[PDB]
């Protein structure tokens, strides 16, 4: 009974295709039979120019639950990224991606992808999702930025 | 006389001592150290009975050493996963899965204070532990003495 979610996602696809930020990618995956799987999207976020993430293209998957948009989609970097707000599993943490926080059925895929891009160079360190990146960020900022640059070069398209 | 399962089910200083003079070996022997989650559980249950009294302090410390030596000395044991799950169960790091953080961190902090001074402890884990024990948190703030002690010890690792 995913009808409502599918109706919304079909429109989000149309909107995204009509206009989206340059360098970004967001496309529904395909089912084995060739049809579109609007509940599972393959996306890519470009690093912000002027930041240590510049040049990198970070792939992530957006998974929508049957009750969307009552619930936010689950966004996971594939592969997992080195960042204080990214779980070792790859799941990204953002207030707008939490049903009990700032998620609102109205939030768009564009807003989410732009929000995650913003998060990349501006990590909210108050409540980290991984101990490794948080520890380095806090104990040696230069080393942290050094690892970020290496990672950005690694995922350069 | 007592048994390991009964102790783990309902931990108490008395039950630990009733395990006998070989209690340390028994705790490690009866714990499936191939599973980080189970090692975290055993570590927390054992440390939960810590009391700053000779017989109990020795019993808890010895148990922790036997357990952690066994766990850490498995070349397959993921020490990073142990640290992460430990922090999650102590309520110091968020997780994707739901876990009810333990109520009192006194014992766990005192047990850790002892553990990080042992040869079997992977020093690479010290910075991560330090990062999350120094990070603001009400549970730790109410366990000031134990928290300060552990941090002072971590400075020496």
mmCIF file with all atom_site columns, C-alpha atoms in Angstrom, chain B:
data_model
loop_
_atom_site.group_PDB
_atom_site.id
_atom_site.type_symbol
_atom_site.label_atom_id
_atom_site.label_alt_id
_atom_site.label_comp_id
_atom_site.label_asym_id
_atom_site.label_entity_id
_atom_site.label_seq_id
_atom_site.pdbx_PDB_ins_code
_atom_site.Cartn_x
_atom_site.Cartn_y
_atom_site.Cartn_z
_atom_site.occupancy
_atom_site.B_iso_or_equiv
_atom_site.pdbx_formal_charge
_atom_site.auth_seq_id
_atom_site.auth_comp_id
_atom_site.auth_asym_id
_atom_site.auth_atom_id
_atom_site.pdbx_PDB_model_num
ATOM 1   C CA . UNK B 1 1   ? 27.947 -21.354 45.133 1.00 0.00 ? 1   UNK B CA 1
ATOM 2   C CA . UNK B 1 2   ? 26.946 -19.377 42.046 1.00 0.00 ? 2   UNK B CA 1
ATOM 3   C CA . UNK B 1 3   ? 27.115 -19.726 38.268 1.00 0.00 ? 3   UNK B CA 1
ATOM 4   C CA . UNK B 1 4   ? 28.019 -17.263 35.528 1.00 0.00 ? 4   UNK B CA 1
ATOM 5   C CA . UNK B 1 5   ? 24.575 -17.049 33.906 1.00 0.00 ? 5   UNK B CA 1
ATOM 6   C CA . UNK B 1 6   ? 22.874 -16.253 37.201 1.00 0.00 ? 6   UNK B CA 1
ATOM 7   C CA . UNK B 1 7   ? 25.443 -13.555 37.891 1.00 0.00 ? 7   UNK B CA 1
ATOM 8   C CA . UNK B 1 8   ? 25.002 -11.988 34.454 1.00 0.00 ? 8   UNK B CA 1
ATOM 9   C CA . UNK B 1 9   ? 21.215 -12.136 34.778 1.00 0.00 ? 9   UNK B CA 1
ATOM 10  C CA . UNK B 1 10  ? 21.172 -10.337 38.124 1.00 0.00 ? 10  UNK B CA 1
ATOM 11  C CA . UNK B 1 11  ? 24.632 -8.848  38.852 1.00 0.00 ? 11  UNK B CA 1
ATOM 12  C CA . UNK B 1 12  ? 25.637 -8.120  42.455 1.00 0.00 ? 12  UNK B CA 1
ATOM 13  C CA . UNK B 1 13  ? 29.017 -7.882  44.220 1.00 0.00 ? 13  UNK B CA 1
ATOM 14  C CA . UNK B 1 14  ? 28.041 -10.845 46.363 1.00 0.00 ? 14  UNK B CA 1
ATOM 15  C CA . UNK B 1 15  ? 27.234 -13.084 43.383 1.00 0.00 ? 15  UNK B CA 1
ATOM 16  C CA . UNK B 1 16  ? 30.552 -12.186 41.783 1.00 0.00 ? 16  UNK B CA 1
ATOM 17  C CA . UNK B 1 17  ? 32.461 -13.240 44.897 1.00 0.00 ? 17  UNK B CA 1
ATOM 18  C CA . UNK B 1 18  ? 30.346 -16.396 45.180 1.00 0.00 ? 18  UNK B CA 1
ATOM 19  C CA . UNK B 1 19  ? 31.630 -17.451 41.761 1.00 0.00 ? 19  UNK B CA 1
ATOM 20  C CA . UNK B 1 20  ? 34.778 -18.449 43.604 1.00 0.00 ? 20  UNK B CA 1
ATOM 21  C CA . UNK B 1 21  ? 38.525 -17.641 43.482 1.00 0.00 ? 21  UNK B CA 1
ATOM 22  C CA . UNK B 1 22  ? 38.551 -18.510 39.763 1.00 0.00 ? 22  UNK B CA 1
ATOM 23  C CA . UNK B 1 23  ? 35.644 -16.186 38.949 1.00 0.00 ? 23  UNK B CA 1
ATOM 24  C CA . UNK B 1 24  ? 37.803 -14.225 36.504 1.00 0.00 ? 24  UNK B CA 1
ATOM 25  C CA . UNK B 1 25  ? 38.513 -17.306 34.411 1.00 0.00 ? 25  UNK B CA 1
ATOM 26  C CA . UNK B 1 26  ? 34.858 -18.373 34.516 1.00 0.00 ? 26  UNK B CA 1
ATOM 27  C CA . UNK B 1 27  ? 33.519 -15.049 33.234 1.00 0.00 ? 27  UNK B CA 1
ATOM 28  C CA . UNK B 1 28  ? 35.854 -15.182 30.231 1.00 0.00 ? 28  UNK B CA 1
ATOM 29  C CA . UNK B 1 29  ? 35.343 -18.916 29.713 1.00 0.00 ? 29  UNK B CA 1
ATOM 30  C CA . UNK B 1 30  ? 31.560 -18.562 29.581 1.00 0.00 ? 30  UNK B CA 1
ATOM 31  C CA . UNK B 1 31  ? 31.469 -15.495 27.344 1.00 0.00 ? 31  UNK B CA 1
ATOM 32  C CA . UNK B 1 32  ? 31.312 -15.813 23.575 1.00 0.00 ? 32  UNK B CA 1
ATOM 33  C CA . UNK B 1 33  ? 34.172 -13.429 22.836 1.00 0.00 ? 33  UNK B CA 1
ATOM 34  C CA . UNK B 1 34  ? 33.686 -13.838 19.091 1.00 0.00 ? 34  UNK B CA 1
ATOM 35  C CA . UNK B 1 35  ? 30.717 -11.457 19.403 1.00 0.00 ? 35  UNK B CA 1
ATOM 36  C CA . UNK B 1 36  ? 31.551 -7.792  20.258 1.00 0.00 ? 36  UNK B CA 1
ATOM 37  C CA . UNK B 1 37  ? 28.012 -7.127  21.454 1.00 0.00 ? 37  UNK B CA 1
ATOM 38  C CA . UNK B 1 38  ? 28.203 -9.984  23.963 1.00 0.00 ? 38  UNK B CA 1
ATOM 39  C CA . UNK B 1 39  ? 31.610 -8.838  25.190 1.00 0.00 ? 39  UNK B CA 1
ATOM 40  C CA . UNK B 1 40  ? 30.185 -5.339  25.732 1.00 0.00 ? 40  UNK B CA 1
ATOM 41  C CA . UNK B 1 41  ? 27.283 -6.850  27.679 1.00 0.00 ? 41  UNK B CA 1
ATOM 42  C CA . UNK B 1 42  ? 29.566 -8.949  29.894 1.00 0.00 ? 42  UNK B CA 1
ATOM 43  C CA . UNK B 1 43  ? 31.925 -6.028  30.474 1.00 0.00 ? 43  UNK B CA 1
ATOM 44  C CA . UNK B 1 44  ? 29.090 -3.752  31.580 1.00 0.00 ? 44  UNK B CA 1
ATOM 45  C CA . UNK B 1 45  ? 27.382 -6.340  33.787 1.00 0.00 ? 45  UNK B CA 1
ATOM 46  C CA . UNK B 1 46  ? 30.665 -7.172  35.530 1.00 0.00 ? 46  UNK B CA 1
ATOM 47  C CA . UNK B 1 47  ? 31.681 -3.538  35.939 1.00 0.00 ? 47  UNK B CA 1
ATOM 48  C CA . UNK B 1 48  ? 28.206 -2.674  37.246 1.00 0.00 ? 48  UNK B CA 1
ATOM 49  C CA . UNK B 1 49  ? 29.092 -4.353  40.552 1.00 0.00 ? 49  UNK B CA 1
ATOM 50  C CA . UNK B 1 50  ? 32.313 -2.414  41.094 1.00 0.00 ? 50  UNK B CA 1
ATOM 51  C CA . UNK B 1 51  ? 32.727 -1.120  44.651 1.00 0.00 ? 51  UNK B CA 1
ATOM 52  C CA . UNK B 1 52  ? 35.784 0.642   46.029 1.00 0.00 ? 52  UNK B CA 1
ATOM 53  C CA . UNK B 1 53  ? 36.366 -2.180  48.495 1.00 0.00 ? 53  UNK B CA 1
ATOM 54  C CA . UNK B 1 54  ? 39.345 -4.570  48.336 1.00 0.00 ? 54  UNK B CA 1
ATOM 55  C CA . UNK B 1 55  ? 37.732 -7.934  47.563 1.00 0.00 ? 55  UNK B CA 1
ATOM 56  C CA . UNK B 1 56  ? 35.150 -6.548  45.139 1.00 0.00 ? 56  UNK B CA 1
ATOM 57  C CA . UNK B 1 57  ? 37.566 -4.208  43.364 1.00 0.00 ? 57  UNK B CA 1
ATOM 58  C CA . UNK B 1 58  ? 40.012 -7.045  42.793 1.00 0.00 ? 58  UNK B CA 1
ATOM 59  C CA . UNK B 1 59  ? 37.254 -9.402  41.622 1.00 0.00 ? 59  UNK B CA 1
ATOM 60  C CA . UNK B 1 60  ? 35.869 -6.901  39.113 1.00 0.00 ? 60  UNK B CA 1
ATOM 61  C CA . UNK B 1 61  ? 39.301 -5.882  37.816 1.00 0.00 ? 61  UNK B CA 1
ATOM 62  C CA . UNK B 1 62  ? 40.443 -9.491  37.423 1.00 0.00 ? 62  UNK B CA 1
ATOM 63  C CA . UNK B 1 63  ? 37.208 -10.412 35.609 1.00 0.00 ? 63  UNK B CA 1
ATOM 64  C CA . UNK B 1 64  ? 37.559 -7.489  33.220 1.00 0.00 ? 64  UNK B CA 1
ATOM 65  C CA . UNK B 1 65  ? 41.167 -8.424  32.488 1.00 0.00 ? 65  UNK B CA 1
ATOM 66  C CA . UNK B 1 66  ? 40.366 -12.072 31.789 1.00 0.00 ? 66  UNK B CA 1
ATOM 67  C CA . UNK B 1 67  ? 37.412 -11.144 29.572 1.00 0.00 ? 67  UNK B CA 1
ATOM 68  C CA . UNK B 1 68  ? 39.098 -8.346  27.615 1.00 0.00 ? 68  UNK B CA 1
ATOM 69  C CA . UNK B 1 69  ? 42.407 -10.204 27.207 1.00 0.00 ? 69  UNK B CA 1
ATOM 70  C CA . UNK B 1 70  ? 40.490 -13.097 25.687 1.00 0.00 ? 70  UNK B CA 1
ATOM 71  C CA . UNK B 1 71  ? 38.478 -10.799 23.425 1.00 0.00 ? 71  UNK B CA 1
ATOM 72  C CA . UNK B 1 72  ? 41.323 -8.501  22.313 1.00 0.00 ? 72  UNK B CA 1
ATOM 73  C CA . UNK B 1 73  ? 43.746 -11.368 21.692 1.00 0.00 ? 73  UNK B CA 1
ATOM 74  C CA . UNK B 1 74  ? 41.573 -12.839 18.968 1.00 0.00 ? 74  UNK B CA 1
ATOM 75  C CA . UNK B 1 75  ? 43.105 -11.507 15.741 1.00 0.00 ? 75  UNK B CA 1
ATOM 76  C CA . UNK B 1 76  ? 39.567 -11.625 14.353 1.00 0.00 ? 76  UNK B CA 1
ATOM 77  C CA . UNK B 1 77  ? 37.922 -9.638  17.172 1.00 0.00 ? 77  UNK B CA 1
ATOM 78  C CA . UNK B 1 78  ? 36.985 -6.162  15.962 1.00 0.00 ? 78  UNK B CA 1
ATOM 79  C CA . UNK B 1 79  ? 38.206 -3.900  18.755 1.00 0.00 ? 79  UNK B CA 1
ATOM 80  C CA . UNK B 1 80  ? 36.764 -0.840  16.995 1.00 0.00 ? 80  UNK B CA 1
ATOM 81  C CA . UNK B 1 81  ? 33.298 -2.376  17.014 1.00 0.00 ? 81  UNK B CA 1
ATOM 82  C CA . UNK B 1 82  ? 33.697 -3.158  20.701 1.00 0.00 ? 82  UNK B CA 1
ATOM 83  C CA . UNK B 1 83  ? 34.577 0.440   21.524 1.00 0.00 ? 83  UNK B CA 1
ATOM 84  C CA . UNK B 1 84  ? 31.730 1.787   19.429 1.00 0.00 ? 84  UNK B CA 1
ATOM 85  C CA . UNK B 1 85  ? 29.129 -0.525  20.955 1.00 0.00 ? 85  UNK B CA 1
ATOM 86  C CA . UNK B 1 86  ? 30.526 0.112   24.444 1.00 0.00 ? 86  UNK B CA 1
ATOM 87  C CA . UNK B 1 87  ? 30.063 3.869   23.947 1.00 0.00 ? 87  UNK B CA 1
ATOM 88  C CA . UNK B 1 88  ? 26.550 3.291   22.625 1.00 0.00 ? 88  UNK B CA 1
ATOM 89  C CA . UNK B 1 89  ? 25.520 1.169   25.605 1.00 0.00 ? 89  UNK B CA 1
ATOM 90  C CA . UNK B 1 90  ? 27.066 3.743   27.956 1.00 0.00 ? 90  UNK B CA 1
ATOM 91  C CA . UNK B 1 91  ? 24.876 6.348   26.268 1.00 0.00 ? 91  UNK B CA 1
ATOM 92  C CA . UNK B 1 92  ? 27.818 8.406   25.036 1.00 0.00 ? 92  UNK B CA 1
ATOM 93  C CA . UNK B 1 93  ? 27.343 7.778   21.301 1.00 0.00 ? 93  UNK B CA 1
ATOM 94  C CA . UNK B 1 94  ? 24.107 7.546   19.305 1.00 0.00 ? 94  UNK B CA 1
ATOM 95  C CA . UNK B 1 95  ? 23.133 4.454   17.304 1.00 0.00 ? 95  UNK B CA 1
ATOM 96  C CA . UNK B 1 96  ? 20.715 3.466   14.539 1.00 0.00 ? 96  UNK B CA 1
ATOM 97  C CA . UNK B 1 97  ? 19.292 0.656   16.670 1.00 0.00 ? 97  UNK B CA 1
ATOM 98  C CA . UNK B 1 98  ? 17.443 1.282   19.931 1.00 0.00 ? 98  UNK B CA 1
ATOM 99  C CA . UNK B 1 99  ? 19.339 0.576   23.137 1.00 0.00 ? 99  UNK B CA 1
ATOM 100 C CA . UNK B 1 100 ? 18.488 1.647   26.667 1.00 0.00 ? 100 UNK B CA 1
ATOM 101 C CA . UNK B 1 101 ? 21.672 3.143   28.109 1.00 0.00 ? 101 UNK B CA 1
ATOM 102 C CA . UNK B 1 102 ? 22.780 1.811   31.480 1.00 0.00 ? 102 UNK B CA 1
ATOM 103 C CA . UNK B 1 103 ? 21.748 3.870   34.512 1.00 0.00 ? 103 UNK B CA 1
ATOM 104 C CA . UNK B 1 104 ? 25.027 4.161   36.428 1.00 0.00 ? 104 UNK B CA 1
ATOM 105 C CA . UNK B 1 105 ? 28.419 4.756   34.794 1.00 0.00 ? 105 UNK B CA 1
ATOM 106 C CA . UNK B 1 106 ? 30.444 4.592   38.013 1.00 0.00 ? 106 UNK B CA 1
ATOM 107 C CA . UNK B 1 107 ? 31.445 0.942   37.665 1.00 0.00 ? 107 UNK B CA 1
ATOM 108 C CA . UNK B 1 108 ? 32.061 1.068   33.887 1.00 0.00 ? 108 UNK B CA 1
ATOM 109 C CA . UNK B 1 109 ? 34.318 4.130   34.267 1.00 0.00 ? 109 UNK B CA 1
ATOM 110 C CA . UNK B 1 110 ? 36.290 2.549   37.102 1.00 0.00 ? 110 UNK B CA 1
ATOM 111 C CA . UNK B 1 111 ? 36.612 -0.714  35.172 1.00 0.00 ? 111 UNK B CA 1
ATOM 112 C CA . UNK B 1 112 ? 37.833 1.214   32.130 1.00 0.00 ? 112 UNK B CA 1
ATOM 113 C CA . UNK B 1 113 ? 40.294 3.097   34.327 1.00 0.00 ? 113 UNK B CA 1
ATOM 114 C CA . UNK B 1 114 ? 41.858 -0.272  35.147 1.00 0.00 ? 114 UNK B CA 1
ATOM 115 C CA . UNK B 1 115 ? 41.605 -1.755  31.639 1.00 0.00 ? 115 UNK B CA 1
ATOM 116 C CA . UNK B 1 116 ? 43.452 1.000   29.797 1.00 0.00 ? 116 UNK B CA 1
ATOM 117 C CA . UNK B 1 117 ? 46.494 0.436   32.029 1.00 0.00 ? 117 UNK B CA 1
ATOM 118 C CA . UNK B 1 118 ? 46.894 -3.203  30.963 1.00 0.00 ? 118 UNK B CA 1
ATOM 119 C CA . UNK B 1 119 ? 49.226 -4.613  28.290 1.00 0.00 ? 119 UNK B CA 1
ATOM 120 C CA . UNK B 1 120 ? 46.364 -6.225  26.368 1.00 0.00 ? 120 UNK B CA 1
ATOM 121 C CA . UNK B 1 121 ? 44.621 -2.896  25.780 1.00 0.00 ? 121 UNK B CA 1
ATOM 122 C CA . UNK B 1 122 ? 44.960 -1.603  22.175 1.00 0.00 ? 122 UNK B CA 1
ATOM 123 C CA . UNK B 1 123 ? 46.409 1.888   22.644 1.00 0.00 ? 123 UNK B CA 1
ATOM 124 C CA . UNK B 1 124 ? 44.806 3.027   19.379 1.00 0.00 ? 124 UNK B CA 1
ATOM 125 C CA . UNK B 1 125 ? 41.488 2.975   21.241 1.00 0.00 ? 125 UNK B CA 1
ATOM 126 C CA . UNK B 1 126 ? 42.637 5.493   23.878 1.00 0.00 ? 126 UNK B CA 1
ATOM 127 C CA . UNK B 1 127 ? 42.079 8.660   21.796 1.00 0.00 ? 127 UNK B CA 1
ATOM 128 C CA . UNK B 1 128 ? 38.557 7.530   20.900 1.00 0.00 ? 128 UNK B CA 1
ATOM 129 C CA . UNK B 1 129 ? 37.718 6.767   24.524 1.00 0.00 ? 129 UNK B CA 1
ATOM 130 C CA . UNK B 1 130 ? 39.199 10.075  25.626 1.00 0.00 ? 130 UNK B CA 1
ATOM 131 C CA . UNK B 1 131 ? 37.135 11.936  23.019 1.00 0.00 ? 131 UNK B CA 1
ATOM 132 C CA . UNK B 1 132 ? 33.858 10.504  24.265 1.00 0.00 ? 132 UNK B CA 1
ATOM 133 C CA . UNK B 1 133 ? 34.562 10.659  27.998 1.00 0.00 ? 133 UNK B CA 1
ATOM 134 C CA . UNK B 1 134 ? 35.571 14.339  27.803 1.00 0.00 ? 134 UNK B CA 1
ATOM 135 C CA . UNK B 1 135 ? 32.549 15.175  25.636 1.00 0.00 ? 135 UNK B CA 1
ATOM 136 C CA . UNK B 1 136 ? 29.641 16.822  27.541 1.00 0.00 ? 136 UNK B CA 1
ATOM 137 C CA . UNK B 1 137 ? 27.096 14.373  28.976 1.00 0.00 ? 137 UNK B CA 1
ATOM 138 C CA . UNK B 1 138 ? 24.888 14.483  32.084 1.00 0.00 ? 138 UNK B CA 1
ATOM 139 C CA . UNK B 1 139 ? 25.499 10.840  33.003 1.00 0.00 ? 139 UNK B CA 1
ATOM 140 C CA . UNK B 1 140 ? 29.249 11.465  33.186 1.00 0.00 ? 140 UNK B CA 1
ATOM 141 C CA . UNK B 1 141 ? 28.835 14.783  34.989 1.00 0.00 ? 141 UNK B CA 1
ATOM 142 C CA . UNK B 1 142 ? 27.139 12.950  37.858 1.00 0.00 ? 142 UNK B CA 1
ATOM 143 C CA . UNK B 1 143 ? 30.089 10.522  38.037 1.00 0.00 ? 143 UNK B CA 1
ATOM 144 C CA . UNK B 1 144 ? 32.724 13.245  38.328 1.00 0.00 ? 144 UNK B CA 1
ATOM 145 C CA . UNK B 1 145 ? 35.280 11.409  40.462 1.00 0.00 ? 145 UNK B CA 1
ATOM 146 C CA . UNK B 1 146 ? 35.353 8.315   38.246 1.00 0.00 ? 146 UNK B CA 1
ATOM 147 C CA . UNK B 1 147 ? 35.288 10.447  35.100 1.00 0.00 ? 147 UNK B CA 1
ATOM 148 C CA . UNK B 1 148 ? 38.202 12.642  36.181 1.00 0.00 ? 148 UNK B CA 1
ATOM 149 C CA . UNK B 1 149 ? 40.189 9.585   37.239 1.00 0.00 ? 149 UNK B CA 1
ATOM 150 C CA . UNK B 1 150 ? 39.717 7.818   33.910 1.00 0.00 ? 150 UNK B CA 1
ATOM 151 C CA . UNK B 1 151 ? 40.687 10.928  31.958 1.00 0.00 ? 151 UNK B CA 1
ATOM 152 C CA . UNK B 1 152 ? 43.809 11.472  34.045 1.00 0.00 ? 152 UNK B CA 1
ATOM 153 C CA . UNK B 1 153 ? 44.711 7.844   33.313 1.00 0.00 ? 153 UNK B CA 1
ATOM 154 C CA . UNK B 1 154 ? 44.026 8.220   29.599 1.00 0.00 ? 154 UNK B CA 1
ATOM 155 C CA . UNK B 1 155 ? 46.460 11.161  29.487 1.00 0.00 ? 155 UNK B CA 1
ATOM 156 C CA . UNK B 1 156 ? 49.180 8.689   30.484 1.00 0.00 ? 156 UNK B CA 1
ATOM 157 C CA . UNK B 1 157 ? 48.452 5.987   27.913 1.00 0.00 ? 157 UNK B CA 1
#
